[PDB]
Amino acid sequence: IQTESRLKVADNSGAKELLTIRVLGGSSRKFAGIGDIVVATVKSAAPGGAVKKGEVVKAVIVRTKSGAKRPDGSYIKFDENAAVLIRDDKTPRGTRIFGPVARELREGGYMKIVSLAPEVL
Amino acid sequence: MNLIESINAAQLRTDIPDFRPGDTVRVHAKVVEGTRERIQIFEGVVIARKNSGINETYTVRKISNGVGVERIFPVHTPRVEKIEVIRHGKVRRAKLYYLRALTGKKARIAERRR
Amino acid sequence: SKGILGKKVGMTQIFTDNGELIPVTVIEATPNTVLQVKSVETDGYEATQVGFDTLREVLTNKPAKGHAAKANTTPKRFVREFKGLEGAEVGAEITVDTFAAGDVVDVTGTSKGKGFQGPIKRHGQSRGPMAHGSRYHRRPGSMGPVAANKVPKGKKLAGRMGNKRVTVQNLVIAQVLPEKNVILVKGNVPGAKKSLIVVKSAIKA
Amino acid sequence: AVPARHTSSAKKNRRRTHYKLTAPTVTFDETTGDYRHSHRVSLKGYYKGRKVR
Amino acid sequence: SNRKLGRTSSQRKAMLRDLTTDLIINETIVTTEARAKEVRRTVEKMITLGKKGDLSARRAAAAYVRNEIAIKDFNEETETFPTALQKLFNDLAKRYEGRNGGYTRILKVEPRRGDAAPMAIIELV
RNA sequence: AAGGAACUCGGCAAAAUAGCCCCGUAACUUCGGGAGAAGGGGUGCUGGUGUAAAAGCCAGCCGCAGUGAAUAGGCCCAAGC
RNA sequence: UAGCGAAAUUCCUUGUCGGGUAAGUUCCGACCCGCACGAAAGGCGUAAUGAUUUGGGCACUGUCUCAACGAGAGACUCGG
RNA sequence: GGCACCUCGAUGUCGGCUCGUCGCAUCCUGGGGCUGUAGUCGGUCCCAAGGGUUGGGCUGUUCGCCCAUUAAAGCGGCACGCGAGCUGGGUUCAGAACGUCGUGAGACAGUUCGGUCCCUAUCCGUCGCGGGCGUAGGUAAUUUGAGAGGAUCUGUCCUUAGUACGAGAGGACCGGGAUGGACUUACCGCUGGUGUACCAGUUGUUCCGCCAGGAGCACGGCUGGAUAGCUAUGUAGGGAAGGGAUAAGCGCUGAAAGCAUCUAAGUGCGAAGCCCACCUCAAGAUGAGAUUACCCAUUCGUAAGAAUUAAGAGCCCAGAGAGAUGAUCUGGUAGAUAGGCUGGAAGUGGAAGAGUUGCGAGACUUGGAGCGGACCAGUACUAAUCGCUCGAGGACUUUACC
């Protein structure tokens, strides 16, 4: 994907907005498809949640236009674009990671986020 | 491409039933994270099939968690075994990307059954 | 040691095993038509200038039927070489089923002739910026430093392009499902339409 | 763009070397003439031995 | 191939769309070699549609033909030649149905003195 | 595609919106304005019935799209002059 | 004198602080040390008005990630 | 800084975009030493330029600052690299304004708005394709390889093992594996994107005398697509492991100097350096190679030559896997080489007519219907017919043996 894009919410975070800055690729990726750790920051947030005005945090990409072709060869899952906030590590922020997800995150270190995710696909 | 049609005609599965452009389909997939060969049933409104040969076939757009999702896979893939028509949807055109909005009456209505 | 005398008919994709949809391809797997060994003494190298593609009467020549002189019979069209040999007969030899260099096959083709192109089009530099009142876009860039009254060579700048043979390394197909007339290979095997795809293997392997 | 020095006319004709015209192959006296080209039509309507105006 | 004709496809379809009717209202026609080549592809398959005498499919050919007055006369009198339709699809084609395609023959006319234009004659039989 | 101004000194150019009707319309104001503020809705056809002076009704038929294309505002906040 | 002040005025220096901004010499608001503000060479205000100048945001987005495609004209092959 | 030696009948002087190259005073990756280094992490220098050396915000402007980073966020040179490649935010017109100076005319790099960047490639040089000759015969295939290029990068995790070390905290070296990141090659069956002679819908309008069904025009009227081919973001790939010479460094034995001493002979080890090895161009590599086959050794006083002509090769035509054109390849009927024909995909979506229902709009039956370009199989139905041109008869000298 491309960074510097506003993205919507899928977790108990209170951050209404989530725009990452740059995912590593060492220093040299311009893509964050799936299974990867990104660096978020927030511009709009709930009355709840943590904090609103430009706070560098970490995140896991969740929804894209499509990520990687499966080793099945069956093809990729969702349509629009979303992600969740990292809870300082591969922990998720809250219980209800609302909305669906795909299986192709569990092969990272993300299976606890998957456990707090209701359904996979 | 007659040797193409020989080789790629071989080894494919015949048992995939006929269907017109997209609808809600019972999907019978076998993927597993626990490496234990778990049945993964899937559903959702197919947009339509892709054309052009034994490989290139349909998607599945399941919107049923507030997120539209898709699933494109060949018919002759042995990882899937069984797929079933829930509503015999017949509309004007092939690949309903007009399905990208106005969810209600496109959702309950695509049938025009006979 | 790899009689891979043959062309493709095109580029496809098939699932092979545990599903695994793979971009798949093929070679026609015509019987090999290899001449004698031609060892190091008369000519310092080792290889075979193997004949292939079985002409009719028209496309021949008295050095071609006259290559069925110093061959035995059946003049052919194409002739390549293979160093790494087994040797059976002076003119025509044994077919596809033997494989004696490797299944990460380093396949050799003769690329698609796309023609003379733009400066970026395969030389891959940055196309110039479009907007903001600047004339400069689709032109590759300066090349001569001022301290010489010269330009250097070496920098790719243009070029009529495409008929350039390539020897790509480790194309990934296993022990091939054979036929009388197929060779499974994988995907973007180089070459072109009606191009011979002969291949020696394991030179980085 | 604008030239620097004078072309020496010998070199000018050395430019003019490959510029020459190529002779077309003409079928010669057929009956006693007249002519066509091979793969072309005579002045008497003949291509492939039959009159077509 | 199906080439650019030096004209906008409006006038490829259109200049085609004139010269076909011209090449049937006259028998054999001398014009240039490239438009002769699109005759070689197109007018063969569409007068091959002329072999079938469906009023529906010839009504699809009614786009391909247009209103004409014959000079293979006397169309205006009792019937010798039709309009552009409905009879010449047999007056031509009854000879032409046993044949398996291939109705023009193209012959390279001596080139034109105008601007060195090599032009050709196409015939139908 | 996907992403958006991250390009650049600078959303520069292009984009996109605009028609007609009907809602609705902040700020200050020198009280006119602002303002078409904004934002919203509708807009095809068939038969009725009501429209001819005259919209709206009813139902249906359809539609990817209903000023089906053309032609016809990008907006807002703020400051200086 | 009034009144305005980092001014279209302070290079004094990225003045200071706060806000916009994660990232902010530019932007705004105050501070006002005013080299060198400043009163009819008007000064401070001031809605509507501007092909204004900037600063921010929304919208839309091939500008750019990173380009690619086809249509026409020259170009280029030939005749004049 | 200084210097006035070219440049006043023109040396266009910022910054940036693009495109790079070299240098090493090496930023990371490589090795090694010392350490006030238990390790882990460090400091420190020696050899090292193979490769790589981030992206944004602000600053017109360098410098610099911030963010987040990685292997690191190198320094310079090159007309502060490049304007007959480009921009014009910067002085560097004329305006106008402020501040300040000058009575004034104006000025003060002090600020700011606006402000006038042409060149139709001749040579050399570049990139790619050709002709003429040569390579003691004419050919036709094959390659070697003299030489020349390309490419070299780098995480992350696990094991070894929380072992060794270390009270501990913390955490190895070596070494195995797995796995990215760029970069770059190929190719479009996949995600697609695009598609101008494919099929649909559809606005308005003229016309096919009527309607129906159609045509034209409105950017391709608009839109849904989409065959071909092209193309990344699509798909796969690499940089592996080597050899050898080694730099630095570390060795044994050793010698003035009975000792010592990596050195003086003499022997080792030792790096992303070098070279070979991986790939490509390659005998115009005049030394023009080497091999495989064919024609052969003709006619004319032939002295000189001339003219046949073989083996061929070509013209000419068709077409594209190729392509600006040439050239390449496929072919030229002993035929699938192009076009048509036939069959099928091919995308479109249920043609038209006819009939049924319905006031109509419309629904439905015929009917996956009908249609269909560059897509494959066959088909000589046309076009590759006919013809013409160029094109060897191979010199000496020496030995072997002719």
- Whether residue B67 and residue A78 make contact (CB cut-off 8 A), yes or no, is yes
* B75 strand F contact, CB < 7 Å: no
* B92 strand F contact, CB < 7 Å: yes
Write the secondary structure of chain E as one string of H (helix), E (strand) and C (coil): CCCCCCCCHHHHHHHHHHHHHHHHHCCCEEEEHHHHHHHHHHHHHHHHHHHCCCHHHHHHHHHHCCCCCCCCCCCCCCCCCCCCCCCHHHHCCCCCCCCCCCCEEEECCCCECCCCECEEEEEEC
Residue E47's contacts (CB-CB under 8 Å, 6 or more residues apart) are: E24, E89, E92, E93, E96, E103, E124
The shares of helix, strand and coil residues in chain C, as percent rounded to the nearest 5, are 0, 15, 85
Asked if E88 and E25 count as a contact pair (C-beta separation under 8 A), the reply is no
Resolution (A): 5.6
- Establish whether the linkage from the previous residue to C97 is cis, with ω within 30° of 0: no
Question: Over the range C54-74, which residues count as b (16 or more CB within 10 Å of their CB) and which as e?
Answer: ebeeeebeeebeebbeebeee
Q: How far apart are CA C184 and CA C99, in angstroms?
A: 13
Chain E partners within 8 Å of D47 (Cβ): 107-108
Asked if C189 and C176 count as a contact pair (C-beta separation under 8 A), the reply is no
Provide DSSP, C76-119.
Answer: -SEE--BSS-----SS----TT---S-SB---EEE----EE--S
**Cβ count near B67 (within 10 Å):** 20
Distance between the alpha carbon (CA) of E98 and the C1' atom of H247, Å = 88
G63: residue with closest CA to C1' = C131
Q: How far apart are CA B73 and CA E107, in angstroms?
A: 54
- The 3-state DSSP class for residue D12 equals helix
- Whether residue E110 and residue D43 make contact (CB cut-off 8 A), yes or no, is yes
Q: How far apart are CA C194 and CA C190, in angstroms?
A: 12
Residue C140's contacts (CB-CB under 8 Å, 6 or more residues apart) are: C119, C120, C123, C125, C157
Nucleotide nearest C132, CA–C1', reads F12
- Whether residue C13 and residue B55 make contact (CB cut-off 8 A), yes or no, is yes
Residues 152-181 of C with CB under 7 A from strand G: none
Interface test with C, best of B7, B13, B32 (most C CBs within 10 A): B7
The answer to whether E107 faces chain D, any CB pair under 8 Å, is yes
Chain C residue at shortest CA distance from B2: C9
* D43 strand G contact, CB < 7 Å: no
Q: How far apart are CA C177 and CA B26, in angstroms?
A: 34
Q: Which residue has the tokens 């695509």?
A: B110
Asked if C75 and C55 count as a contact pair (C-beta separation under 8 A), the reply is yes
Interface test with E, best of D40, D44, D50 (most E CBs within 10 A): D40
Chain A residue at shortest CA distance from C15: A73
* A3 strand G contact, CB < 7 Å: no
Q: What tokens were used for D49?
A: 């031995």
CA distances from C43 to C37, C86, C91 (A): 11, 17, 18
- Whether residue B3 and residue C21 make contact (CB cut-off 8 A), yes or no, is no
* A54 strand G contact, CB < 7 Å: yes
Closest CA relative to residue B42, chosen from B69, B15, B22, B21: B69
Q: How far apart are CA B98 and CA B67, in angstroms?
A: 16
Chain A partners within 8 Å of C21 (Cβ): 72-73
Nucleotide nearest D18, CA–C1', reads H131
Asked if C52 and C28 count as a contact pair (C-beta separation under 8 A), the reply is no
Taking the CA of residue C204 and the nearest CA in chain B, the distance in Å comes to: 31
Distance between the alpha carbon (CA) of D1 and the C1' atom of H10, Å = 20
φ and ψ of A40, to 5 deg: -85, 165
Chain C residue at shortest CA distance from A75: C21
CA distances from B86 to B26, B27, B91, C24 (A): 7, 11, 15, 34
| CB-contacted nucleotides of strand F (7 Å) | 1-4, 6-10, 12-13, 63-64
Nucleotide nearest E39, CA–C1', reads H339
Structure letter (DSSP) for residue C132: T
**Long-range pairs for C120-123: beta carbons < 8 A, 24 or more residues apart:** C121/C161, C122/C161, C123/C156, C123/C157, C123/C158, C123/C159
Taking the CA of residue D14 and the nearest CA in chain E, the distance in Å comes to: 28
Asked if C70 and C79 count as a contact pair (C-beta separation under 8 A), the reply is no
Q: What tokens were used for C119?
A: 């400066």
Q: How far apart are CA A20 and CA A32, in angstroms?
A: 10
- Whether residue C19 and residue B78 make contact (CB cut-off 8 A), yes or no, is yes
Distance between the alpha carbon (CA) of E23 and the C1' atom of H377, Å = 33
Name the E strands within B1-114. 25-29, 40-42, 83-85
Distance between the alpha carbon (CA) of C203 and the C1' atom of H246, Å = 27
Segment (H or E) for D51: strand D50-51
Chain A partners within 8 Å of C187 (Cβ): none
Nucleotide nearest C152, CA–C1', reads H126
Question: Over the range E47-69, which residues count as b (16 or more CB within 10 Å of their CB) and which as e?
Answer: bebbeeeeeeebeebeebbeeee
| CB-contacted nucleotides of strand G (7 Å) | 20-23, 62-69, 71-73, 78-80
Single-letter residue type at B28 = H
Q: How far apart are CA C42 and CA E40, in angstroms?
A: 56
The answer to whether D26 faces chain E, any CB pair under 8 Å, is no
Asked if E54 and E89 count as a contact pair (C-beta separation under 8 A), the reply is no
Nucleotide nearest C186, CA–C1', reads H236
Minimal Cβ distance to A74: which of B62, B68, B73 = B73
Q: How far apart are CA A49 and CA D48, in angstroms?
A: 92
